[PDB]
């Protein structure tokens, strides 16, 4: 059975990193764990990892938006950024706006690595399941 995860936005998020829905809707989680915003790798190897986050707001002020996927484990007391995108000057001041950020690539990960997603502006995030998500699979 294939190690795989696809999780969807969780509205609850009060803090960083984001939390994700792991049980309901169009989600998958098999041979990989979810713990406090984090996907926990249990088998060392190559995985393709991806995330999309959907940002939007009533009235643009071009607050920089940042989206990062990062790794943490016990062996070092500091995170490693695996992928990241930043948006600046993305809308016309004062208008309703919306834009997503997409990240996906391959990484060698180790057992007990924990992966997380971070964002600059939690309040601009929209959490619909089809719009905002975080997933991976073992190659």
């Amino acid at each position: 059975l294939r190690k795989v995860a696809h999780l969807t936005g969780k509205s609850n998020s009060r803090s960083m990193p984001l939390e994700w829905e792991d049980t309901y809707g169009i989600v998958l989680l098999s041979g990989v764990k979810y713990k406090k915003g984090g996907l926990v790798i249990n088998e060392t190897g190559l995985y393709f990892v991806y995330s999309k986050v959907y940002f939007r707001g009533q009235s643009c002020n071009n607050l920089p938006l940042s989206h990062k996927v990062y790794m943490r484990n016990s062996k070092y007391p500091q995170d490693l950024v695996m992928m990241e995108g930043k948006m600046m000057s993305y809308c016309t001041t004062g208008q309703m706006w919306a834009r997503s950020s997409y990240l996906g690539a391959v990484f060698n990960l180790t057992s007990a690595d924990h992966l997380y997603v971070n964002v600059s502006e939690l309040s601009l995030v929209n959490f619909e399941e089809s719009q905002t998500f975080f997933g991976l699979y073992k190659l």
Binding site: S11, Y24, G25, I26, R56, Q58, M96, A98, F127, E128
Partner: protein
Amino acid sequence: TPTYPWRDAETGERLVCAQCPPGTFVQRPCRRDSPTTCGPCPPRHYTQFWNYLERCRYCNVLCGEREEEARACHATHNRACRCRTGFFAHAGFCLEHASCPPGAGVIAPGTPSQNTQCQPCPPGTFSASSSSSEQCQPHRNCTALLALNVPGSSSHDTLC
């Protein structure tokens, strides 16, 4: 009662099965000797139509902070939202109802589907406020009781 085509997994035989009603899903397909068996939607899930799904759908509509529940999640339908009082729906957002400035009055207040509508105050009426409710009101008839110090405008009452 609607139906669906189904091959027995045991035999391959071609059967006509009855579908399950809103609020249920297919728990066991029909076979030669028994009909379809439906089970009840579990919490947070739903089926709104006759179906032959093998599990219910999740209530995946959630109400943002400027919205409220117009209908609840229920075994027979997803949740639905609308804009809370004070807001209206526009291109997926819930926007604040506009205010009509001084000189203009409300001819229709905001609803969940429409913004406030304003007219410039017509002759003999005024509105002194930026307000999403205040309508144009007639000037006081000073003469009808003093004499006028200053005639009213569309934004200021008549002064005595």
